[PDB]
Amino acid sequence: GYRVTGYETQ
């Protein structure tokens, strides 16, 4: 298994 996140704001 694995986990991933991403987040961005201008």
Curated annotation (Swiss-Prot):
What does the record say about tissue specificity? Answer: Expressed in heart, small intestine, kidney, liver, lung, skeletal muscle, testes, pancreas, and ovary (at protein level).
PTM field: Phosphorylated by FASTK; phosphorylation occurs after FAS ligation in FAS-mediated apoptosis and before DNA fragmentation.
Relate the outcome reported for changing residue 8 to K. Answer: In WDM; results in a mild increase of stress granule numbers compared to controls; impaired stress granule disassembly
Connected disease: Welander distal myopathy: An autosomal dominant disorder characterized by adult onset of distal muscle weakness predominantly affecting the distal long extensors of the hands, with slow progression to involve all small hand muscles and the lower legs. Skeletal muscle biopsy shows myopathic changes and prominent rimmed vacuoles. Rare homozygous patients showed earlier onset, faster progression, and proximal muscle involvement.
Q: How does it assemble?
A: Homooligomer; homooligomerization is induced by Zn(2+). Interacts with FASTK; the interactions leads to its phosphorylation. Interacts (via RRM1 and the C-terminal glutamine-rich (Q) sequence) with SNRPC/U1-C (via N-terminus); thereby facilitating spliceosomal U1 snRNP recruitment to 5' splice sites.
Q: What does this protein do?
A: RNA-binding protein involved in the regulation of alternative pre-RNA splicing and mRNA translation by binding to uridine-rich (U-rich) RNA sequences. Binds to U-rich sequences immediately downstream from a 5' splice sites in a uridine-rich small nuclear ribonucleoprotein (U snRNP)-dependent fashion, thereby modulating alternative pre-RNA splicing. Preferably binds to the U-rich IAS1 sequence in a U1 snRNP-dependent manner; this binding is optimal if a 5' splice site is adjacent to IAS1.
Q: What is this protein called?
A: Cytotoxic granule associated RNA binding protein TIA1
Source organism of the structure: Homo sapiens (Human)
Q: Which gene name does the record give?
A: TIA1
